[PDB]
Design a binder for this molecule. Structure first.
Ligand SMILES: OC[C@H]1O[C@@H](O[C@H]2[C@H](O)[C@@H](O)[C@H](O)O[C@@H]2CO)[C@H](O)[C@@H](O)[C@H]1O
Length: 139
């Protein structure tokens, strides 16, 4: 709920839903002893996950997926850089476009994720969980 130094798990509501052109900023720190953390764009408290972003420190992967109508779909993992190294600070910018989420990290394009939940407007919950320290979250 706060903007600065919010504790994990973070739960924040997107007023008027996830509007087209809406940008979410997440500034954080990856703990050296952490294993994984997740950023979830969700429909209402404990419903569908339109976009699940899950950096995993053991294998250095950045897994993207959707949890829709009870099931995970296919993972998207391709990147040209991993900014979530142990003990690193990162600055994420997440923009909801008409056909895809566009995600930048430290100013550099990280991934696009095409919408699988088509009506992206339905997303009203930003969730952040796991092994991550947050300095700033702007919704
Ligand atoms: O796909 C996101 C989802 O992954 C789950 O783990 C997967 C694992 O990544 C995959 O290699 C295997 O085929 O299936 C596992 C179970 O679905 C995580 O458990 C879950 O939290 C999400 O991160």
């Amino acid at each position: 709920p706060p903007t600065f130094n919010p504790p994990v798990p973070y739960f924040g509501r997107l007023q008027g839903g996830l509007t087209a052109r809406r940008t979410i900023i997440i500034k954080g720190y990856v703990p050296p002893t952490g294993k994984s953390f997740a950023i979830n764009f969700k429909v209402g408290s404990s419903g569908d996950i339109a976009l699940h972003i899950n950096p995993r420190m053991g294998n250095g992967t950045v897994v993207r997926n959707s949890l829709l109508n009870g099931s995970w779909g296919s993972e998207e993992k391709k990147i040209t850089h991993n900014p979530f190294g142990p003990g690193q600070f990162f600055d994420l910018s997440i923009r909801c476009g008409l056909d895809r989420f566009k995600v930048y990290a430290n100013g550099q394009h990280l991934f696009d994720f095409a919408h699988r939940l088509s009506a992206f407007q339905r997303v009203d919950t930003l969730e952040i969980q796991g092994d991550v320290t947050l300095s700033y979250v702007q919704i």
